Amino acid sequence: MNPIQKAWLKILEPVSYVINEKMAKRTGIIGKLGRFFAIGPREYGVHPINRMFIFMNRKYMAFQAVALHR
Amino acid sequence: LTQYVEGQIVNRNQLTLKKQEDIEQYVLKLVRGYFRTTNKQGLNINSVLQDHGLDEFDSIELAMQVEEDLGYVISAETIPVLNKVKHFVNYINHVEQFKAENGKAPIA
Amino acid sequence: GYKIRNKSIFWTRAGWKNNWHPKNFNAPRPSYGEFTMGIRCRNDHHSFLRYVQTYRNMSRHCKQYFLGDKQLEETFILGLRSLFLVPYDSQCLTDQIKHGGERRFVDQLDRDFELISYNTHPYQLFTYTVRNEHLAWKNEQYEKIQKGEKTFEQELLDYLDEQVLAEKAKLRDGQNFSIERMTEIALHVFRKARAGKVRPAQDVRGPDGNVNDFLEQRRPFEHPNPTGVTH
Amino acid sequence: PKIVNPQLWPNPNKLRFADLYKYQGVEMKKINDSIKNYKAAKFYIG
Amino acid sequence: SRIINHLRGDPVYQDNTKDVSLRGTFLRGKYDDLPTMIFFTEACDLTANWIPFFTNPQYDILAHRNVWLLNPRNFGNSDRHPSFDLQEMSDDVMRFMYSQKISMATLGGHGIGGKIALAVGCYHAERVTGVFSIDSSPMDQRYHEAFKEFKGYVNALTEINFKTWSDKDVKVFLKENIKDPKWRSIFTNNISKNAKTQSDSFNFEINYLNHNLNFNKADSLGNWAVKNGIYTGRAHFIFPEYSRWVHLATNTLPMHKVCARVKGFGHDIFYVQGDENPLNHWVYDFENYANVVASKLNKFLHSYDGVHALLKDRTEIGNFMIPDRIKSRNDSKHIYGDYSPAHLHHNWRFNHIYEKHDELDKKLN
Lengths: 70, 108, 231, 46, 365
Ligand SMILES: COC1=C(OC)C(=O)C(C/C=C(\C)CC/C=C(\C)CC/C=C(\C)CC/C=C(\C)CC/C=C(\C)CC/C=C(\C)CC/C=C(/C)CCC=C(C)C)=C(C)C1=O
Known about the structure:
This is part of a larger assembly, with chains A (70 residues), B (108 residues), C (231 residues), D (46 residues) and E (365 residues). Chain A is an all-alpha fold and 70 residues long. Chain A has four helices and no strands. Chain A has helices spanning 3-11, 13-23, 29-36, 48-68. Chain A is elongated, with a radius of gyration of 21 Å. Chain C is mainly alpha-helical. Chain C has a two-stranded antiparallel ribbon with strand order 1-2. Chain E is 30% helix and 13% strand. Chain E has ten helices and eleven strands. Chain E has an eight-stranded mixed sheet. Chain E has a two-stranded antiparallel sheet with strand order 7-8. Chains in contact: A-C, A-D, A-E, B-C, C-D, C-E, D-E. Strand 3 of chain C pairs antiparallel with strand 11 (339-340) of chain E, so a sheet runs across the interface. Ubiquinone-8 (UQ8) binds next to helix 4 of chain A.
């Protein structure tokens, strides 16, 4: 979760009501459509790019300390 | 001149002994206050700190406390010879005489 | 369980388990005055006093951030001595080190003090974290005692004291309530209490006494698997 | 913000299943530590 | 007395392989409700010899599980039947578990006993939590030197006729024909005198056994047939470093070949550090070998036995969610997602613990 996801939720508050309360619990294709596009927290919502930067930043920074501490 | 004591800032007080009897009492109170000292009541003027669970590194902590209570600046060359209660008593006198004759503190 | 089988594991070209003077070609050789014109050497006889002042500094500079916690100052001292007593108690013959173990260890402790002077030594940051977690748990006990409430630690002691009475009231043939028996009683309670933290005791069943908790469960709608796919 | 729950299945009890509800907080806790550095660097960058 | 309880009965020769009942010793656990462990001793070997292993405070195995030291058919006090088909001998255990009201059990074995234990998991996996095999492998051992001696000794034992032979004639026969000290002692103690001192005989069926071994075909106990299949559940193998029965070089591959969940050496397969000694097969005698087996056994029972395949350890129960396959549930309005697999009570069928806890759950709400 992050602030940008929380902004979507405030904007999608009425949309969440229509899809989740009404559509998601119907039967038929209308239910399959609502349960599929259900609004909430992200499944597998992690961002590998952001995580990649964090790893290389920490790995490259430890090299700086060795190279600079002479 | 202030120090933390159990999370509270307390004003530190310095002592001025200028008397033999006051020195022997201060050192014993000092050595008996150290958590490593054994047989605190068996401690006397002629007690070897080694015989009470104290080593060279504990004499340093004691000297560090003498600077806190008296304001002295003890050099590293003088600490390793303080292995008895008698040694702290005689060193404290030599410092008081040096300042009373030379008008300055000994070389640190 | 498993022991090293190679008998020559601790063998070196300098002897068995020799980590003080490894064998090298350029070995130390003597010097003669009558034949020596000049020399460039860094060895001196100042390592002893540097070993003393280094202790006084590392001790006094660490206490600046203890906030007068007497119990922490005494604990830190025991840890500081364990760091300076390594050369005196080690298997390594520190008096036979290649070019002087005294200068080597002193120069090493000086690098630790430099980090201490900046309050950046990992032992310092580790001491702050360890102590804060301890005081948060001690203050929780204090807040519960001032309210007259019972601590989870006292409830165990009282539950263990009564179990000992029940177990010794039937131990009449013998009368040696060994420390072994006292121990397994406490561990059995700990294992049930340990599992109780994650699954508290709802009813007379006790801590972690519900089979239904171990039936098929699913992540809540509000917290799905963020790290990977689910199907 | 409150999230609408279709209530198709009952969510696990936080007391009995607490680890399932932790990841969300630690993620924001990471970001807050980063923001402390952004603010502390206002004078250096400026 | 109480902790040690071995049901008493007389062997019955059976013409039908389904009317076979198993008998053995039961070791009660320290605690009230514990899952059960069924352990099979070496062929022609006494169950009592394993009592000090399972009744040692240092190991404290009974603190974990109740132990059933059970004898297979044609061994010990159990019924007798010429067939040794692992499928038939496995059904015997399922009836015993039914007669004793055991829903599912942990299975163990020593040597050939390990095969019998693993066969039950291969034929009845839904009711077996784990398998712990000691100095055995699901492998053809007909040509192993250790088996040949056992196969050879059993054949020599067919020459003695207790009716005509005197007590001294027997003792002289064993020392000369049986060189191994342990096997010799095991066989001597297996000799028993029936009521009214009518005559002495072996507790095990010497005729049916020799035919199984002497014929030396697929049904032989040394053989492990492809018909036995694969074991789907938890399996841990422990054998001596220098063992005549399981050679570390190649006799570990059958475990991977037969057990699907076996990860490999260092995780589910271990060897005990030891010297070359033909007596290392009997780990329970030597403390050094036994201490490692017990520690590894207690670890398997505590953390690995009865744990779902895709979970690492018992610690992950309730905190690790397994992915679900699509279109695997009957409900059509089901949002497929990760789930923690269901782990049931060890005897949920023959008790009402679920019916009881359902009521208590309602009282909360
Ligand atoms: C200083 O010490 C050092 C380190 O720290 C120790 C290092 O880690 C390192 C190593 C360096 C790294 C680990 C970084 C690696 C990064 C690399 C290789 C490049 C990464 C490139 C990307 C992730 C792609 C980015 C692509 C885009 C931003 C384009 C898409 C976005 C668009 C078009 C949005 C428009 C953006 C702007 C107008 C810029 C304004 C900035 C904003 C934050 C506005 C954001 C606005 C919104 C609405 C979110 C070094 C060299 C170093 O010197």
